A paper describes a structure:
The encoded, site-specific, incorporation of ncMs via cellular translation requires the creation of orthogonal aminoacyl-tRNA synthetase (aaRS)–orthogonal tRNA pairs. Here we break this deadlock by developing tRNA display, which enables direct, rapid and scalable selection for orthogonal synthetases that selectively acylate their cognate orthogonal tRNAs with ncMs in Escherichia coli, independent of whether the ncMs are ribosomal substrates. We build on these advances to demonstrate the genetically encoded, site-specific cellular incorporation of β-amino acids and α,α-disubstituted amino acids into a protein, and thereby expand the chemical scope of the genetic code to new classes of monomers. Moreover, we build on our advance to enable the site-specific co-translational incorporation of selected β-amino acids and α,α-disubstituted amino acids into a recombinant protein produced in E. coli; we produce milligrams of ncM-containing protein per litre of culture, and solve the structure of a β-amino acid-containing protein.
For ncMs 12 (6-((tert-butoxycarbonyl)amino)hexanoic acid (BocAhx)) and 13 ((S)-3-amino-3-(3-bromophenyl)propanoic acid (β3-mBrF)), we identified enriched and selective sequences, and found that the most selective hits converged on a distinct sequence pattern for each of these ncM. Notably, two PylRS variants, PylRS(13_1) and PylRS(13_2), identified by tRNA display selection, directed 13-dependent acylation of tRNACUAPyl, as judged by fluoro-tREX. To investigate the incorporation of the β-amino acids, α,α-disubstituted amino acids and β-hydroxy acids into proteins we added the orthogonal synthetase–orthogonal tRNA pairs for 13–20, the cognate ncMs, and GFP(150TAG)His6 to cells. We observed ncM-dependent GFP production for 13, 15, 18 and 19, with isolated yields ranging from 3 to 35 mg per litre of culture, and mass spectrometry confirmed the incorporation of these β-amino acids and α,α-disubstituted amino acids in GFP. To further characterize the incorporation of 13 at position 150 of GFP, we solved the structure of GFP(150(S)β3mBrF)–His6 at 1.5 Å resolution by X-ray crystallography (the protein was purified from cells harbouring PylRS(13_1) and tRNACUAPyl). The electron density shows consecutive carbon atoms (C2 and C3) in the protein backbone at position 150; the meta-bromophenyl substituent is attached to C3 of the β-amino acid, and the stereochemistry at C3 corresponds to the expected (S) stereoisomer. Our structure confirms the site-specific incorporation of the expected (S)β3mBrF-monomer in the protein. The introduction of (S)β3mBrF leads to a notable kink in the beta strand of GFP, when compared to the wild-type protein. Notably, the hydrogen bonding networks of the residues immediately preceding and following the β-amino acid in the polypeptide chain remain essentially unperturbed; this indicates that this beta strand can accommodate the β3-amino acid at this position.
Author numbering: 4 to 64, 134 to 298
The structure:
Amino acid sequence: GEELFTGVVPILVELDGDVNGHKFSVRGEGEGDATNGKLTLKFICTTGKLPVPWPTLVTTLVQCFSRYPDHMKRHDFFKSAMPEGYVQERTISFKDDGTYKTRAEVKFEGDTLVNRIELKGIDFKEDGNILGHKLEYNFNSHXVYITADKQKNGIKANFKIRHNVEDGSVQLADHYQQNTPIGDGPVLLPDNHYLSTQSVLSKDPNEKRDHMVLLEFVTAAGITHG
């Protein structure tokens, strides 16, 4: 499905969440440019005040927009599953705190790439870095390690997110990921590699709702030319 990503593609993101019994919704819109590995989106909390820090939701809120270099084209599972798309499931374990469990469908709905997510959070501390809102409003560059899951005709990924904390410490979030195609058409099953990620978080001066503006660049790496 790599032909679907040669230009700029519109994106819609819909998240329904529950964290320690607090119900919230997020809606996002923007565009993806896989040629340059670039994502530009704005998210709104449509239920009022977001009950967790915006940075904790960034990984949950479309790896089909990653830039795969030409020599790594045969390792791009994410585009190969389009347009019917894939199911992306995670467990995110916040060190010394709670756990998110997520299930999303990523697929084309007409000409728009849509990411529809359900999130359940449990076992969070009221006084912790997440429900205490003690995380900095920023985002680090990460190491996303991908391996084939031959049995399920899909992939797994494993990686650590580093959330800077206002007291100068780091809140680790361990990510465990599975992706399975929605269609029965063939997909690419990759050799081991990683996605090199970078993001910045900002605000829109004319937006009164609780929101996050996101710019992200992602490139695949870890396989030698030849």
